[PDB]
Design a protein around this ligand. Structure first.
Ligand SMILES: [Cl-]
Ligand SMILES: [Cl-]
Ligand SMILES: [Cl-]
Ligand SMILES: [Cl-]
Ligand SMILES: [Cl-]
Ligand SMILES: [Cl-]
Ligand SMILES: [Fe+3]
Ligand SMILES: [Fe+3]
Ligand SMILES: [Fe+3]
Ligand SMILES: [Fe+3]
Ligand SMILES: [Fe+3]
Ligand SMILES: [Fe+3]
Ligand SMILES: [Fe+3]
Ligand SMILES: [Fe+3]
Ligand SMILES: [Fe+3]
Ligand SMILES: [Fe+3]
Ligand SMILES: [Fe+3]
Ligand SMILES: [Fe+3]
Ligand SMILES: [Fe+3]
Ligand SMILES: [Fe+3]
Ligand SMILES: [Fe+3]
Ligand SMILES: [Fe+3]
Ligand SMILES: [Fe+3]
Ligand SMILES: [Fe+3]
Ligand SMILES: [Fe+3]
Ligand SMILES: [Fe+3]
Ligand SMILES: [Fe+3]
Ligand SMILES: [Fe+3]
Ligand SMILES: [Fe+3]
Ligand SMILES: [Fe+3]
Ligand SMILES: [Fe+3]
Ligand SMILES: [Fe+3]
Ligand SMILES: [Fe+3]
Ligand SMILES: [Fe+3]
Ligand SMILES: [Fe+3]
Ligand SMILES: [Fe+3]
Ligand SMILES: [Fe+3]
Ligand SMILES: [Fe+3]
Ligand SMILES: [Fe+3]
Ligand SMILES: [Fe+3]
Ligand SMILES: [Fe+3]
Ligand SMILES: [Fe+3]
Ligand SMILES: [Fe+3]
Ligand SMILES: [Fe+3]
Ligand SMILES: [Fe+3]
Ligand SMILES: [Fe+3]
Ligand SMILES: [Fe+3]
Ligand SMILES: [Fe+3]
Ligand SMILES: [Fe+3]
Ligand SMILES: [Fe+3]
Ligand SMILES: [Fe+3]
Ligand SMILES: [Fe+3]
Ligand SMILES: [Fe+3]
Ligand SMILES: [Fe+3]
Ligand SMILES: [Fe+3]
Ligand SMILES: [Fe+3]
Ligand SMILES: [Fe+3]
Ligand SMILES: [Fe+3]
Ligand SMILES: [Fe+3]
Ligand SMILES: [Fe+3]
Ligand SMILES: [Fe+3]
Ligand SMILES: [Fe+3]
Ligand SMILES: [Fe+3]
Ligand SMILES: [Fe+3]
Ligand SMILES: [Fe+3]
Ligand SMILES: [Fe+3]
Ligand SMILES: [Fe+3]
Ligand SMILES: [Fe+3]
Ligand SMILES: [Fe+3]
Ligand SMILES: [Fe+3]
Ligand SMILES: [Fe+3]
Ligand SMILES: [Fe+3]
Ligand SMILES: [Fe+3]
Ligand SMILES: [Fe+3]
Ligand SMILES: [Fe+3]
Ligand SMILES: [Fe+3]
Ligand SMILES: [Fe+3]
Ligand SMILES: [Fe+3]
Ligand SMILES: [Fe+3]
Ligand SMILES: [Fe+3]
Ligand SMILES: [Fe+3]
Ligand SMILES: [Fe+3]
Ligand SMILES: [Fe+3]
Ligand SMILES: [Fe+3]
Ligand SMILES: [Fe+3]
Ligand SMILES: [Fe+3]
Ligand SMILES: [Fe+3]
Ligand SMILES: [Fe+3]
Ligand SMILES: [Fe+3]
Ligand SMILES: [Fe+3]
Ligand SMILES: [Fe+3]
Ligand SMILES: [Fe+3]
Ligand SMILES: [Fe+3]
Ligand SMILES: [Fe+3]
Ligand SMILES: [Fe+3]
Ligand SMILES: [Fe+3]
Ligand SMILES: [Fe+3]
Ligand SMILES: [Fe+3]
Ligand SMILES: [Fe+3]
Ligand SMILES: [Mg+2]
Ligand SMILES: [Mg+2]
Ligand SMILES: [Mg+2]
Ligand SMILES: [Mg+2]
Ligand SMILES: [Mg+2]
Ligand SMILES: [Mg+2]
Lengths: 173, 173, 173, 173, 173, 173
């Protein structure tokens, strides 16, 4: 009884993989934001997202697997072979990737209900909430590139974003 | 003048790659130590090593590159396709990989002197020191599997290792 | 036995001279940044670099000489006979001079190894590290002139640079 | 109206030059006091005078020039080509140079009145007061070499001079 | 791989031996400074040097050997069969022995580079720095015997040396 | 009157020698306990005994000699040419050596009474008390190797022995 769902196990190993590979791309994008685009605070913002993906995002999946008999797979391949041409396109690409996360997570929630896997549906709620929270944070930075042509003005707003004391939203936090 | 050494740039991108891929293997080994071998404290010890490799070990290289004109490359491929058969062999494999780190780092230091790259020789001293410090920490855990046949006795000593307040050794710390 | 190297003694007296003369040029550049270019915070940034060169940079050499039998020479000649035409060129010239420091320091380290002067190789590591740290700090200001056309926007970022509480980087600090 | 006096501008650039060059000579004399005469506290006393000349003494002139339209000139040449033969003669030479400062400053005050430059007469009062204060401090050390033949006894008194908490005299402080 | 260098192992066992035997000679010299020369503070100064040699100087070598597979050898023979004839010659002999330490350490650093033993080159930097720091401290006491003919005056300065709160020099400390 | 006893002077120089040579053997045994037997806490216990022998045990004798006209001799020869084959035999050898200390000290006390040297009889009481206190501490570790076959269990008890806050026994402390 209570035998783990192989399909959920697969989708969650795929999501583990995505979060590792995303985190490694974001670490590269963070380097480039500072080094090539002269935007160290944009770099810090993207580096923090890197550490979220390679941190709690993958960690919680590994922890979940230990509780329920699911098997962890580590199979990672990613190469950063071209970069967006400027900072605005850099954060727009981060935006595009986070939007894809929301769609991947939606599939996992739908699958958990289909499997009558209510522990997995419960578990994935964190990723449902964080999918939109993460997109909103990236959106707040995308907006800046449309509200000013001055990189240092943009950088000052990003600086207060990354140095603000995090206070969770009651629902999305 | 002061034009970066392409050979050092390559060896340091290779070392960036190694630290990413090691860190991902250690994250898997940490999961297995808890989940399969029933050694959660060994898991925590290896997980902390995972975060060191994916943390300051790669970070300092990226930071160095921004200072001197070297180019960062992100090109990662690793798959955990078999695991050691028990906890003793698990930590012995971690030991073997850390010993290899010492040898990779030795080559980079030797190369920096050959290139008369004294900023790179200075930079790599951190990795020279940390190579032996890391090996010593893993060695301290390997010894436990040779001093007791009882996994819970071993686990209690590892627990005080991972929960000790870190106090740096004057030379190796 | 342990008789001081005359060649190192010469190269270090030359480096003492450079740091005095640089410091005096930077004191002039600091005056001009405020007085002619209306950039008092750029002035404060360059004045702080002035005091570093005329402070610990020369002091440590004098202190080293007292320990090992090397002779100090004071022979200083510098005249500021033209200035860069605007603030961007002013900080670019500071950048050029700091890059030259890295090259002078590299020669001294190479020479210490050639002389088997390991106390001097140890001593010069401070200047190896500080060569890149100083260049990075000046680079951070150069970038600002490429990220905004507004001198007051640039000045606000420099102000937070000079008024930040200094926290040393683990390697370069 | 209120057009700066070219003669005062010249005399103050000359005084800027003197304070730089004095400060560099005192830095050398400080090294020699410790290194050759075995008087580290005499060295510290002279080093503190070095930092005063290269510090507020020149700084206030640069700051004054920014307020009133005077032009700063940086033109420095000094070489320490012989040293006094012992510590008593070393501090006697420092005394002689400080006495010359009083005479240079007197000329500037006289000139400010001749030019009806009351801002400059006000500004130079600091240097009038400090001229005598500095001479008195050096005189206090000269006296020691006439009150004891024992260098360590002299050194102990100098040590309490340099380590005393500075408390300004109501007039000369 | 990473097999320890037998030559470094030998030179470091020899340096372990030197530090033991020096420490035992200094313990005797400390006794004599008080008992025969009536200089208890000179005795305390030399006793502190005794404890440094028999303390961290040998300890760090033993600790290093445990990390890398080098073998410790304990083989000690020293007899104090004559003493210098007065306190000045006593501290001059201590000076001579510390100068020899600098030369022994220089050979070990040179050897580590020859062996491409970068962990050993890193390890020995502590002894490179401490070689000159120790010599400077002994030099400060030698100078006293040339600056006064009064043993109690000399003793008072040594007393403030040994009772000062140690504050490390940024480079040599 | 009150002329020092030459026989006591000899026996106390011999005891000074024993404590130096014992301390050096214990420093080696401490290294081996950690490095070869994988018992770092046993190593710390023996290292602390090393520092006692080379510390107050010899120090008090040197201090005594300064008070009464006895002459200090430094004549040290010891080589560790074989080690016990395991940790139990290592601590049993330490036990054997401490038992010999009790017998050496007994001879000195007996001799002081024979010489009517009541200052020496008083002085040696410290060593009479410490002879048994030291043996008891080593005995407490010997017992552990007879109460468990598990080196890590033994190590945990030794760890609380070496990390306990020392509280002196009213008589033996
Ligand atoms: Cl199902
Ligand atoms: Cl090159
Ligand atoms: Cl040479
Ligand atoms: Cl006029
Ligand atoms: Cl080799
Ligand atoms: Cl008698
Ligand atoms: Fe399947
Ligand atoms: Fe750049
Ligand atoms: Fe940066
Ligand atoms: Fe966040
Ligand atoms: Fe978790
Ligand atoms: Fe599993
Ligand atoms: Fe597995
Ligand atoms: Fe590819
Ligand atoms: Fe790509
Ligand atoms: Fe851009
Ligand atoms: Fe664009
Ligand atoms: Fe999109
Ligand atoms: Fe579905
Ligand atoms: Fe949630
Ligand atoms: Fe997130
Ligand atoms: Fe290439
Ligand atoms: Fe299980
Ligand atoms: Fe667990
Ligand atoms: Fe750690
Ligand atoms: Fe960093
Ligand atoms: Fe690049
Ligand atoms: Fe790139
Ligand atoms: Fe594969
Ligand atoms: Fe594998
Ligand atoms: Fe197992
Ligand atoms: Fe096995
Ligand atoms: Fe191995
Ligand atoms: Fe090479
Ligand atoms: Fe380091
Ligand atoms: Fe590490
Ligand atoms: Fe316990
Ligand atoms: Fe020459
Ligand atoms: Fe103006
Ligand atoms: Fe201003
Ligand atoms: Fe700074
Ligand atoms: Fe200094
Ligand atoms: Fe000299
Ligand atoms: Fe000179
Ligand atoms: Fe000229
Ligand atoms: Fe010029
Ligand atoms: Fe401008
Ligand atoms: Fe321009
Ligand atoms: Fe340049
Ligand atoms: Fe050279
Ligand atoms: Fe440094
Ligand atoms: Fe600097
Ligand atoms: Fe603002
Ligand atoms: Fe004119
Ligand atoms: Fe000297
Ligand atoms: Fe000094
Ligand atoms: Fe003052
Ligand atoms: Fe001012
Ligand atoms: Fe002007
Ligand atoms: Fe100008
Ligand atoms: Fe000249
Ligand atoms: Fe001269
Ligand atoms: Fe003199
Ligand atoms: Fe004279
Ligand atoms: Fe005069
Ligand atoms: Fe006049
Ligand atoms: Fe005033
Ligand atoms: Fe003054
Ligand atoms: Fe051999
Ligand atoms: Fe006496
Ligand atoms: Fe005494
Ligand atoms: Fe010390
Ligand atoms: Fe140690
Ligand atoms: Fe060994
Ligand atoms: Fe041995
Ligand atoms: Fe002999
Ligand atoms: Fe002798
Ligand atoms: Fe004497
Ligand atoms: Fe003499
Ligand atoms: Fe000598
Ligand atoms: Fe060699
Ligand atoms: Fe050091
Ligand atoms: Fe030392
Ligand atoms: Fe006094
Ligand atoms: Fe006799
Ligand atoms: Fe081992
Ligand atoms: Fe250890
Ligand atoms: Fe004790
Ligand atoms: Fe004592
Ligand atoms: Fe005696
Ligand atoms: Fe003697
Ligand atoms: Fe022998
Ligand atoms: Fe033996
Ligand atoms: Fe054993
Ligand atoms: Fe046995
Ligand atoms: Fe026995
Ligand atoms: Fe007897
Ligand atoms: Fe007692
Ligand atoms: Fe004891
Ligand atoms: Mg249904
Ligand atoms: Mg070469
Ligand atoms: Mg060579
Ligand atoms: Mg008039
Ligand atoms: Mg070579
Ligand atoms: Mg009787």
């Amino acid at each position: 009884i209570m035998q783990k769902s192989n399909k959920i196990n697969d989708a969650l190993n795929q999501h583990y993989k995505l979060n590792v590979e995303l985190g490694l791309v974001y670490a590269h994008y963070a380097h480039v934001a500072d080094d090539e685009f002269d935007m160290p605070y944009l770099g810090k913002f993207i580096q923090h997202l890197s550490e979220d993906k390679l941190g709690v995002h993958k960690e919680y999946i590994s922890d979940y697997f230990k509780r329920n008999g699911m098997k962890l797979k580590t199979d990672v391949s990613v190469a950063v072979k071209s970069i967006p041409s400027d900072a605005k396109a850099l954060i727009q690409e981060v935006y595009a990737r986070e939007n894809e996360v929301r769609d991947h997570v939606k599939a996992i929630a739908k699958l958990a209900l289909a499997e009558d896997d209510y522990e997995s549906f419960y578990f994935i709620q964190w990723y449902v909430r964080d999918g939109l929270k993460d997109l909103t944070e990236v959106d707040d930075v995308v907006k800046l590139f449309n509200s000013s042509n001055d990189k240092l003005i943009i950088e000052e707003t990003i600086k207060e974003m990354v140095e603000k004391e995090e206070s969770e939203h009651e629902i999305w936090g």
